[PDB]
Amino acid sequence: MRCIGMSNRDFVEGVSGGSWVDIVLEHGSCVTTMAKNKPTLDFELIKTEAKQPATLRKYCIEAKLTNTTTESRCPTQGEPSLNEEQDKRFVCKHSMVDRGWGNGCGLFGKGGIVTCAMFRCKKNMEGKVVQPENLEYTIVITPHSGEEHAGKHGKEIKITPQSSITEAELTGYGTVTMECSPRTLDFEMVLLQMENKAWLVHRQWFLDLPLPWLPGADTQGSNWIQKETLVTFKNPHAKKQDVVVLGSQEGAMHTALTGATEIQMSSGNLLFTGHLKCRLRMDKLQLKG
């Protein structure tokens, strides 16, 4: 009934016997195949999703600062240093500040000062790269029998442009053999994920985003790159300097993505509206009854 109720329905039939029959599968449409002494079948492409696509880069969009520490030297005594300046979890800056008798120095003049603060990301987003392969299409093959329900599902099969020819069993009728091709969907693009909501964005834009990031293959989630993007170092003072972090950028991001094609998703997987070309053989199918 599902296919009968669809407006987009193709009727295909093989002009030979034991031959292959071609059909085109689209989301929201179905194809009904028929052949002499063979049951009539319904085909529908219901899902197209990328499974575990490679993570390109994790961007931090909200952070906090803790243990801010300052060190400074008098004019003439070189650049000061802090060992935490070697700890990848800190953001640091080197500057010069006036010094003199009023703050412990023999000479009046510029002195070297350094300040570090531990950087802790509280909310990040990640962009992934979807490979044409590893995409998984779900196709339902339903026997056109007319039997009732209101336990009789069509066979569901999942394939990949890398999987081999499929032999699907249809309880009662035998098996149907088919092969598909993702025949023309693009992926120099990237898929941005901001807390269960995703978007398709162009590359080099994602890579240019001024936000702290980490190479995709990370798990520490601590050694952020270019933390200064979310940190501001106020003008220093003889012995102390304040450091403040920008506020969340989730908003600046949202109202920045308006326009780019939004991508649905669930269970962490991204979903797309795929297009398939398949060929099937019915030599192993027979009438039930």
Binding site: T68, T70, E71, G104, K240
Partner: protein, 80 residues
């Protein structure tokens, strides 16, 4: 305040209830008196840590912490 050290040097963990009072702690070289003039709030995650220079007969300039016998590090939270 809790007296500890940072690389051989004395370090003061100053709590909220000490705001406005002279900080004194004994040292081999006599009694040290640091003066805290700091945003000094409640001890929390948001700490800041820096040095209180030694100041002998010199007026303080561009600083809110200093000792008169031995340079000391200081740490306090800014929470409220």
């Amino acid at each position: 305040f809790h007296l500890t050290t940072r690389n051989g040097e004395p370090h003061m963990i100053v709590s909220r209830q000490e705001k406005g009072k002279s900080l004194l702690f004994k040292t081999e070289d006599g009694v040290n008196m640091c003066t805290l003039m700091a945003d000094l709030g409640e001890l929390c995650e948001d700490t800041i840590t820096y040095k209180c220079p030694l100041l002998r007969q010199n007026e303080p300039e561009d600083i809110d912490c200093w000792c008169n016998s031995t340079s000391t590090w200081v740490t306090y939270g800014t929470c409220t």
